[PDB]
Design a protein around this ligand. Structure first.
Ligand SMILES: *[C@@H]1O[C@H](CO)[C@@H](O[C@@H]2O[C@H](CO)[C@@H](O)[C@H](O)[C@H]2NC(C)=O)[C@H](O)[C@H]1NC(C)=O
Ligand SMILES: *[C@@H]1O[C@H](CO)[C@@H](O[C@@H]2O[C@H](CO)[C@@H](O)[C@H](O)[C@H]2NC(C)=O)[C@H](O)[C@H]1NC(C)=O
Ligand code: OLC
Ligand code: OLC
Ligand code: OLC
Ligand code: OLC
Ligand code: OLC
Ligand code: OLC
Ligand code: OLC
Ligand code: RET
Ligand code: RET
Ligand code: NAG
Ligand code: NAG
Ligand code: DAO
Lengths: 304, 304
C-alpha cells in the first residue's frame, strides 16, 4: 500500500518516515504547506458569503410572487432550500476545518461535512430527473401540473436521503479525502464491518447511472420528435450540462480509486475535484437569473 | 522597549526568548497561530472578489450613460478608479503575503501594499472636501460646474500623492504593522535618516485635520443658515459618516503609538483596525447604489 490506513481514515501519504498523523488529531502539515490549506479556507469563505445571499434571495422572491408556481419554479425553490442546508449545515465545518488544517470536531464534523454535500448533490440530480420527465411530457405529449411538481419535490428528498443517510448508520461511512479537509464516501478501504463494497456499487448504479439513463432517454425523445416552453427547455439543457461539468471529474476519480485501492496517488489527486464540486451550492440560481426572464424581472422588482 | 526593532521593521513582540524573525525572511508563526493568518487571507480574497466587479461596474455604467455628468457622478467615477488601483496594485500583495505568513516579496511588497492603500484613502478624503465645497456652494449660494468638478478630481490626486509618495523616496517609510501582513506609515521608531517625526506631524495636520476643518465648516453652513439636490446632500452626509467609521479607529491607534513609542502592545492591537480600514475599497459604490436613484436605474438598465 502507498498510503496509510487507520481505524477511520485513509491518508494518501506513506508512513515510511513516521510523520503521518490522524486527521482527527493534528494538523496535516506533513502532506501540504500551510498556504495550501489557507487557499481552501479562503475559497470556502467565498462560497459561504455568496451562497447564503443568492439562495436566500431565490427563496424569498419565489414565496413573495404567487405567479411563480410552474414546475420549474418549484424545483428551483427546492434547490435553493437544499443549497442553504449545504452552506450552513456543511460548509461551516469545511471552513473551520480548513483554517486549522484538520477535523478539529473529529468524526462528527466529518459526518456533517459529508452528509449535507451528499444530500444536496443528490437532490440536484434527482431534480434533473423530475425536470426531464416534465419536459418530455410537456413537449412530446405522450398534463404535468402543480401536484406532479410537488410530488417530484418530495421524491427528490426520499431518494437523496436513501443515499446520504446509510453512511451515518453503518452502511459505508464518511471519510476524509485529499488534503483531509473534506469528507466523502469511503472508496479507499474494504472495511467489511460496514460492507463498503456493496454501498459503492449501489450508489453508482441507483444514484448515478439510472438517473442519467432516464434524463438522456427523455432528451433523446425530445430531439427525434411555444416560445415560453422553449425558454424552459433551454434552461434545463444548461442545468444538465452544468451538472456534468461539476460532478463528472469527481465521479471519475472516485471510481478510479475504488478500482485501484492502495495505488500510488497523492493528496492533490482528490483535493481539486472535491472542492470544485462544492460550487454546486451556488451555480443553479445563477443560471436561473440568466435564463428565465419572468423570474429575473421578479427579482429586480423585489430588489428595487 | 517591549518590541523588537530591526533595520526596516518593528515587531510588537519581545525578543527576550530569541524567537523573533524578520517579517521579510520567515513566517510570523511565533506571534500568531496559522489559523489567524488564514483568517486574514480569506478576508482579503473576499474583498478582491467583491471589489473588482462592483468598482468595474460603476466605471462601466458611468462611461456608458452620457447623462451621468454631475459633480457627484465624476467624483464617484474617480473613486471607482482609485478603488481598482487599490485592489490590483495593493490587495494582491496582501493576499499573497497573508497566505504565506510574511512579506515573501520583501520591502518592495511592503511598498506596494502601503502606497496604494494610502493613495486610495487620501483620494477618498480629499474627494469629500470637494463634495463639501460643492454642496456648500450649491445649497448656500454664497455656479459649480463640470470644469470645477474635474478640476477637483485632479486636485485629489495631487494632494494624495503629496502624502503617499515621499515614504517611497526617503521622507518616512512604509513598515509592516500588527501581525506583519500589512504595511503603513512608520509611527514606531525615530529613524532620523528618514526624518520620521516631521512626516507624521505633516500627515496628521495637512492630510487629516485640515480636510476635516473644511468639511465641517461647510456642513456648519448647511445646518445653521430641490428634491433632486436634497438626495445628493443626503448621500454626501452618509459618505462622510462612513469614512469616519472606517478611518477613525486606525487614526486613533496610530496616534497613540506615535506618542507612546516602545510601550507594551501586541500584534492584535493594530491588526484589526488595519484590516477593518481595507473595506474602504468597496463601500463607496454600495452607498451609491442605495442612495442615488438615477445611478441605480442606469445600473439596472445596463446590467439587464
Ligand atoms: C506512523 O509511524 C509512526 C512511527 O512508527 C507512528 O508513531 C508511533 O505510534 C505508536 C502507536 O501509538 C507509538 O507507540 C509510538 O510512540 C509512535 N512513535 C512516534 C515516533 O511517534 C504513527 O502512529 C504512524 N501513524 C499512523 C497514522 O499510523
Ligand atoms: C532575536 O534574538 C536572537 C537570539 O539572540 C537573534 O538570533 C541570533 O542572531 C545573531 C546575529 O545574526 C546570530 O549570530 C545568532 O546565531 C542568532 N541566534 C539564533 C539562535 O538564531 C535574532 O537575530 C533576534 N531577532 C531579531 C529580529 O533581532
Ligand atoms: C499619476 C497621477 C495623475 C494625476 C492627474 C489626474 C488627472 C485626471 C484628470 C482628467 C481630465 C480628463 C478630461 C475629460 C474630459 C471630459 C469631458 C466631458 O465629459 O464633459 C465635457 C464638458 O463639455 C465640459 O464642460
Ligand atoms: C462618527 C463615528 C465614529 C465611529 C468610530 C468610533 C471609534 C472609537 C474608537 C477609537 C479608537 C481609539 C484608539 C485608542 C487607543 C488606546 C489604546 C490604549 O490605551 O491601550 C493601551 C494598551 O496597552 C494597548 O495594548
Ligand atoms: C426538511 C425540510 C425540507 C423542506 C423542503 C422544501 C421544499 C420547498 C417546497 C415548497 C412548495 C410550496 C411552496 C409554497 C409557498 O412558498 O407559498 C405558497 C403560498
Ligand atoms: C473557469 C475555469 C474552469 C476550469 C475548471 C477545471 C476543473 C478541474 C477539476 C479537477 C480535475 O479535473 O482534477 C482531476 C485530477 O485528477 C486532480 O487534480
Ligand atoms: C473555479 C474553481 C476551480 C477549482 C478550485 C478548487 C479549490 C481551490 C484550490 C485549492 C488548491 C490548494 C492546493 C494547491 C496545490 C498546487 C500544487
Ligand atoms: C495614472 C493616473 C490615472 C488617473 C485616472 C483618473 C481618472 C479620472 C476619472 C474621471 C475623468 C473625467 C471623466 C472622463 C470621461 O469618462 O469622459
Ligand atoms: C506630487 C508628489 C511629490 C512627491 C515629493 C516627494 C519629495 C520627497 C523628498 C525626499 C528627500 C530624501 C532625501
Ligand atoms: C466536499 C464534499 C464532497 C466531495 C461531497 C461528496 C458527495 C458525493 C459522494 C456525491 C456523489 C454523487 C453525486 C451527488 C452526483 C454524481 C454521482 C455521485 C454518486 C458521484
Ligand atoms: C492595510 C493598509 C493600511 C492600514 C493603509 C494605511 C493608510 C494610511 C496610513 C492612511 C492614512 C489616513 C487616511 C488616508 C485618511 C484618514 C487620515 C489618515 C492620515 C489616518
Ligand atoms: C503502490 O505503488 C506502486 C508504484 O506504482 C505500485 O507498483 C503498487 O502496486 C502500489 N500498491 C498497490 C497496493 O496498488
Ligand atoms: C514596556 O512596558 C512596560 C510595562 O507597561 C512599561 O512600563 C515600559 O515603559 C514600556 N517600555 C517603554 C519604552 O515605554
Ligand atoms: C463593525 C465592527 C467594528 C470593528 C472595529 C475595528 C477596530 C477596533 C479597534 C480595536 C483595537 O484597538 O485593536
Amino acid at each position: 500500500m502507498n498510503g496509510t490506513e487507520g481505524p477511520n481514515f485513509y491518508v494518501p501519504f506513506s508512513n515510511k518516515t513516521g510523520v503521518v498523523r490522524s486527521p482527527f488529531e493534528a494538523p496535516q502539515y506533513y502532506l501540504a504547506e500551510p498556504w495550501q490549506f489557507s487557499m481552501l479556507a479562503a475559497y470556502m469563505f467565498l462560497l459561504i458569503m455568496l451562497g447564503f445571499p443568492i439562495n436566500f434571495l431565490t427563496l424569498y422572491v419565489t414565496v413573495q410572487h404567487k405567479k411563480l408556481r410552474t414546475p420549474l419554479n418549484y424545483i428551483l425553490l427546492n434547490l435553493a432550500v437544499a443549497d442553504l442546508f449545504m452552506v450552513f449545515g456543511g460548509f461551516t465545518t469545511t471552513l473551520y476545518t480548513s483554517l486549522h488544517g484538520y477535523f478539529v470536531f473529529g468524526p462528527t464534523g466529518c459526518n456533517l461535512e459529508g452528509f449535507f454535500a451528499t444530500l444536496g448533490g443528490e437532490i440536484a440530480l434527482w431534480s434533473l430527473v423530475v425536470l426531464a420527465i416534465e419536459r418530455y411530457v410537456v413537449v412530446c405529449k405522450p398534463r404535468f401540473g402543480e401536484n406532479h411538481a410537488i410530488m417530484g419535490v418530495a421524491f427528490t428528498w426520499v431518494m437523496a436521503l436513501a443515499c446520504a443517510a446509510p453512511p451515518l448508520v453503518g452502511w459505508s461511512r464518511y471519510i476524509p479525502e485529499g488534503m483531509q479537509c473534506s469528507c466523502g464516501i469511503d472508496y479507499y478501504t474494504p472495511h467489511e464491518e460496514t460492507n463498503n463494497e456493496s454501498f459503492v456499487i449501489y450508489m453508482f448504479v441507483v444514484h448515478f447511472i439510472i438517473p442519467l439513463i432516464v434524463i438522456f432517454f427523455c432528451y433523446g425523445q425530445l430531439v427525434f420528435t411555444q416560445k415560453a416552453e422553449k425558454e424552459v427547455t433551454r434552461m434545463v439543457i444548461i442545468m444538465v450540462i452544468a451538472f456534468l461539468i461539476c460532478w463528472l471529474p469527481y465521479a471519475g476519480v472516485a471510481f478510479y480509486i475504488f478500482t485501484h485501492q492502495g495505488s500510488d496517488f497523492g493528496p492533490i489527486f482528490m483535493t481539486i475535484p472535491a472542492f470544485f464540486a462544492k460550487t454546486s451550492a451556488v451555480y443553479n440560481p445563477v443560471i436561473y437569473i440568466m435564463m428565465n426572464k419572468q423570474f429575473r424581472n421578479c427579482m429586480v422588482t423585489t430588489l428595487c
